[PDB]
Paper text:
Recombinant [name], expressed without its first 26-residue lipidation signal sequence, was crystallised in complex with cyanocobalamin. The crystals belong to space group C21 and contain two [name]/cyanocobalamin complexes in the asymmetric unit. The structure was refined to 1.6 Å resolution with good stereochemistry, achieving Rwork and Rfree values of 0.191 and 0.216, respectively (data collection and refinement statistics are summarised in Supplementary Table S1). The two complexes in the asymmetric unit are structurally similar, with an RMSD of 0.095 Å across 199 equivalenced Cα atoms. Four loops (AB, BC, DE, HI) are directly involved in binding to cobalamin. An interesting distinction is observed in [name], where Trp 78 is involved in interactions with the dimethylbenzimidazole group of cobalamin. In BtuJ2, this tryptophan is replaced by a pair of tyrosine residues, resulting in a modification of the interaction with the cobalamin side chain (d), which was sandwiched between the dimethylbenzimidazole group and Trp 78 in [name]. For example, displacement of cyanocobalamin from [name] by BtuJ2 yielded a Koff of 0.032 s-1, corresponding to a Kd of 0.16 nM. The major binding motif (MNTPSY in [name]) includes the highly conserved Tyr245, a hallmark across the IPR027828 protein family; also known as Domain of Unknown Function, DUF4465.
In the human gut commensal [name], cobamide uptake is mediated by multiple operons encoding outer membrane proteins, transporters and uncharacterised lipoproteins, some of which are incorporated into bacterial extracellular vesicles (BEVs). The previously uncharacterised [name] and BtuJ2 proteins share 23% amino acid sequence identity and belong to the IPR027828 protein family. [name] and BtuJ2 share a core jellyroll β-barrel structure, where the polypeptide chain forms eight β-strands organised into two four-stranded antiparallel β-sheets. In [name] and BtuJ2, the core structure is augmented by three additional antiparallel β-strands at the N-terminal end of the jellyroll and an α-helix located between strands D and E in the traditional jellyroll nomenclature (BIDG and CHEF).
Author numbering:
A (entry chain B): 26 to 256
B (entry chain A): 27 to 256
Write the structure that this text describes.
Amino acid sequence: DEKMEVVISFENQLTEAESEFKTDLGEKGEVYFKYEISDPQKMIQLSHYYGDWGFGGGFTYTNKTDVKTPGYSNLSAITGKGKNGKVYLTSNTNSFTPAQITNLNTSKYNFKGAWVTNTTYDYLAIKDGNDGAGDYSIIKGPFSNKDNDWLKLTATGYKADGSKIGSIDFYLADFRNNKQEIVNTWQWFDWSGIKEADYITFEMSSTDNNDNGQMNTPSYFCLDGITLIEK
Amino acid sequence: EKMEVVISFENQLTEAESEFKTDLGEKGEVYFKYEISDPQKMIQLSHYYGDWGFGGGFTYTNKTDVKTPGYSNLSAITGKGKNGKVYLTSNTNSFTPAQITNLNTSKYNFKGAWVTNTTYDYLAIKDGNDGAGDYSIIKGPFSNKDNDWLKLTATGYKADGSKIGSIDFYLADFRNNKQEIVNTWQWFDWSGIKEADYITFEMSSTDNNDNGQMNTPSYFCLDGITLIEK
Ligand code: CNC
Ligand code: CNC
């Protein structure tokens, strides 16, 4: 009668410290190769993209602990560790590499949610105005109350036929109303609003955009402890 | 029971010798991206535009030019549609992927569509005239000597992005002493990918550059896209 939770884990799936998942099994698109990671329990699929700069986007799993190095070469969470353990997910989500989670048994399980935090990459960009790009900077500067700055992660749920259920937002940073919030801990992102989703896509948006409306803030985030619930 | 729906852009253009154009796209790198809905809201078609006008995906046109070479002509080599005056022209590549989305996949499956060559491709294949001027990008006309061919591939996907399958149609074929260049409307059956939420298109040929990129124009024409009630 009481409905069981299943926590997705990549714990003990990396054989080396300070490492990430890599594959050469993708299919080549425009820029990147595309692959689908299945978790060890075959509960979910995660989109995975790679290319000329290493990890491209979608998701990879990592145990990296680097909380100091700016720029895209660092895939670490600002926490320096997972919520449940050593191994967590890093994502880059955009029109080239859309980050997608697919439920492999949607008739049996619903989505509950996941723990979320910032990448070190995003944290240092927002806090210090240091995106690591060097002499050239792509970002406008650090986030401020002056500009009412914010960074939003949006999860959109879909049915198996492609019908949109809904969107739900999580603020990774927020300088509205004299707050100075930059997420640097694991925080629960509840997905009960899209629990019936066959798949979930991720989009990011901020107050730091170019003249073509494209976000300058890195479109990266971290997840851990993705939780499903028996229906 | 088993009733078909034919998608039509007939009488959606108010001028002769015209094409669909919009400024409602979202800017990418090279091209703006837009989604055309048909008048019945049965399908979406990807549509791209940029500095040379029509970029790729699809547009609808009633143009009848069967003589002018090069990319400025979007006409079918037929000079008309299968069902009427208005048909689809496509350019499909990694910049502008041509996609048809089924807007009610729980109710309808895909059946197929009529296909032909663009004037652009026909004159390139038949005459070795791509219209690029003093510069020619193509190798020459298609020949039996080189066993030449041009293939259009339709790939079917579920809404989650899982590949169902691929189906090929040969727009030209010089293998094994054939001398086929498609210059009429021909049925391209999609029963192999009928359950697709969306279909993408890719083209390939025997005329490639040193980087393996197709020189033959990656253009084609469609008409009478057909869905069937499940
Ligand atoms: C188009 C694009 C863009 N990209 Co790239 C993405 N997605 N990118 C690309 C592509 C460029 C080529 C193509 N096929 O068009 C593509 C997919 C290959 C690419 C690659 C990368 N990109 C990457 C990232 C993270 C970023 N990219 C953006 C610049 C991000 C852009 C968004 C933005 N807000 O700026 C972006 C959408 C638009 C750039 C543009 O055309 N500007 C206008 C143009 C006129 O100016 P430009 O100065 O001549 O543009 C050049 C640079 O932008 C350069 N470039 C592109 N991305 C980067 C990233 C870095 C760190 C550097 C140093 C240069 C680049 O390529 C452009 C042409 O040469 C970015 C702001 C997007 C975001 N996440 O918000 C971001 C950097 C964040 C930051 N503040 O540090 C990659 C690390 C992604 C990956 N593979 O993991 C990687 C690194 C490339 C590198 N050179 O070191
Ligand atoms: C990259 C590329 C290519 N393109 Co353009 C595409 N998609 N293209 C582009 C981009 C160029 C970006 C840039 N750097 O300036 C991009 C997206 C802007 C572009 C644009 C177009 N392209 C177009 C087409 C149809 C073509 N392109 C190809 C040349 C097609 C290429 C495929 C191929 N098989 O050649 C291609 C994939 C590779 C070119 C390359 O890097 N290598 C060649 C390099 C070493 O030599 P290059 O001589 O210096 O290359 C230049 C030309 O290729 C030029 N260029 C690119 N496209 C064309 C088209 C024409 C008609 C002319 C005269 C020049 C060009 O840009 C390059 C750099 O300056 C093409 C063979 C692809 C195909 N199979 O359909 C085809 C021409 C077919 C033919 N035999 O006539 C457009 C009409 C598409 C549209 N928008 O509807 C348009 C026209 C541009 C124009 N100048 O008049």
